[PDB]
């Protein structure tokens, strides 16, 4: 790749028919209305920085007998929007993180009454030493985590 690792493509199912590509070189990748975000998505419903994706070095506790990935990288999806995003089947509350498995469909905004439906398809084109690329790290099948100063710090300098 020339600098692209993950591809988030606002599919036709969403009001947006565009394709976004997270330049592996940029970490973390910010998405939202304001062009300031590495990704450009303007939806009056979401905030200037509705959400951002961050890549981190994947590492387990121990390797007794079995030898896991040892120490590779995994892409994380962070959400900071008020409308809360939805990843596949997990809820994303303002200040949450989620693993992005190859072919991860993330819902940025969904309105039942407003019929406002959004969603991006994550397609890993390049694997920057990815432990795998994003299969769900076994056992833990798609679980939502909380964000900390580390994540908030990245957006703070947005």
């Amino acid at each position: 790749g020339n600098g692209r690792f993950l591809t988030l493509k606002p599919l036709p199912d969403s009001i947006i028919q565009e394709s976004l590509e997270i330049q592996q070189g940029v970490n973390p990748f910010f998405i939202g209305r304001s062009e300031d975000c590495n990704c450009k998505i303007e939806d009056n419903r979401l905030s200037r920085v509705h959400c951002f994706i961050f890549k981190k070095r994947h590492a387990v506790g121990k390797s007794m007998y079995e030898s896991p990935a040892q120490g590779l990288d995994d892409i994380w999806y962070c959400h900071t929007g008020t409308n809360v995003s939805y990843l596949n089947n997990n809820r994303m509350i303002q200040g949450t993180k989620f693993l992005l498995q190859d072919g991860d469909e993330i819902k940025i905004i969904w309105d039942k009454n407003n019929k406002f439906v959004i969603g991006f398809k994550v397609e890993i084109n390049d694997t920057t030493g990815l432990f795998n690329e994003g299969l769900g790290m076994l056992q833990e099948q798609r679980v939502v985590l909380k964000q900390t100063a580390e994540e908030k710090d990245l957006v703070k300098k947005l």
Binding site: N44, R45, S47, N83, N114
Partner: peptide, 9 residues
């Protein structure tokens, strides 16, 4: 001229 987030219920 807009600059607010339409937070849904």
């Amino acid at each position: 001229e807009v600059e607010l987030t339409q937070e849904l219920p």
